[PDB]
């Protein structure tokens, strides 16, 4: 519906989210993903760390700069899962990937916008309680991601500003609710109730 949909990546399964996002991009919807460092993957941390090291050992023998490129950042890990679900070698696939943006944290342009979630990909709604899972932020650090602390510091600063904004918004909402309640019990309110509004 919205011209741009911003998805908060916290608490989403990587594969389930990537499948949903890839289909949206091919259907013509622009998608922005934020907080890629809070993504989850099913299975314990050690098991997923072994999987990435299996990916690390794959490289072109005669020239390593030709072989598969191993990106360490959480946003790039999600991008790899997404690109594998798109025919990226075609012009149609290239156009779809140009309608997608992935960021660690919430950069300033999108920190004042509305974020949504994908219920089909949420860990708390999919995984059986008690099952082990890993966070993409700690997995990236163990394989050579250098900017975990910088993102954490910036996120803490953003949340302080966002909490102050919510305090003013909450107080304004209470004032609006009181005026609507007082404006009820009138003839206009009675007619609206009969029509469902």
């Amino acid at each position: 519906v919205e011209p741009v949909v911003v998805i908060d990546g916290k608490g989403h399964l990587v594969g389930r989210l990537a499948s949903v996002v890839a289909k949206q991009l091919l259907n013509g919807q622009k998608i922005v993903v934020v907080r890629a460092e809070e993504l989850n993957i099913s299975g314990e941390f050690f098991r997923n760390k072994l999987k990435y090291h299996d990916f690390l050992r794959k490289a072109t023998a005669f020239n390593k700069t030709r072989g598969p490129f191993h990106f360490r950042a959480p946003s790039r890990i999600f991008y790899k899962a997404l690109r594998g679900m798109v025919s990226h070698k075609t012009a149609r696939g290239k156009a779809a990937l140009e309608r997608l943006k992935v960021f660690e944290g919430i950069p300033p342009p999108y920190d004042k916008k509305k974020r949504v979630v994908v219920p089909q990909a949420l860990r708390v709604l999919r995984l059986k309680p008690g099952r082990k899972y890993t966070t993409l932020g700690k997995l990236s650090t163990s394989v050579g991601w250098k900017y975990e602390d910088v993102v954490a510091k910036l996120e803490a600063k953003r949340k302080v500003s966002s909490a102050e904004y919510y305090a003013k918004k909450r107080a304004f909402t209470k004032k609006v609710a009181s005026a609507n309640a007082t404006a009820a019990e009138s003839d206009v309110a009675k007619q609206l109730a009969a029509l469902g509004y």
């Binding site: 998805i7 949504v116 979630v117 994908v118 219920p119 089909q120 708390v124 709604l125 309680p129």
Partner: protein, 171 residues
């Protein structure tokens, strides 16, 4: 499929030497009457010197549950073939009809022992009339006085791709 219970009555073909042969009856669980008659000859050929070409079906009638809206404890005896050997087994199922219990039984055998339909013989299905004759704990735990339990971690269904709030699993 969805099982129905039939009574099937058969006999040997009449002869001048032996007019009016004996009538044999059995109860068969099947998804239709065509399968039910086929199963009747399968078990009859295991007990008497007779086959379909040498006999006839007298009557086939569907048997309905007497009290389909009453919860009953059923004891079931089965014989099945594993990958190496044949075994007998007793299990208990709690349902509201015999056909419902049998349908659960075939699902349970497939899930826990990988036994297909062809490898299972239903020996007997009988309702357990009294408490303390139930000998399986997974059934006995539902017979406690004033049984209550919650349903934690409710997962709701979403008809839209995107949601504008974090969902809750309260119940």
């Amino acid at each position: 499929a969805h099982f129905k219970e039939y009574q099937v009555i058969g006999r040997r073909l009449p002869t001048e030497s032996v007019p009016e042969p004996k009538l044999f009856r059995m109860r068969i669980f099947a998804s239709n009457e065509v399968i039910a008659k086929s199963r009747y000859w399968y078990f009859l050929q295991k007990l008497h010197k007779v086959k379909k070409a040498s006999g006839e079906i007298v009557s086939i009638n569907q048997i309905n549950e007497a009290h389909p809206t009453k919860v009953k404890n059923f004891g079931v005896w089965v014989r099945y073939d594993s990958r190496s050997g044949t075994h007998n087994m007793y299990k208990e199922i709690r349902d509201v009809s015999r056909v419902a219990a049998v349908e659960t039984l075939y699902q349970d055998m497939a899930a826990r022992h990988r036994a297909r339909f062809r490898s299972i013989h239903i020996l007997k299905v009988a309702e357990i009339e009294k408490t303390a004759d139930v000998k399986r704990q997974y059934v006995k735990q539902f017979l406690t006085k004033d049984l209550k339990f919650p349903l934690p971690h409710r997962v709701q269904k979403s008809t839209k791709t995107f949601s504008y709030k974090r969902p809750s699993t309260f119940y």
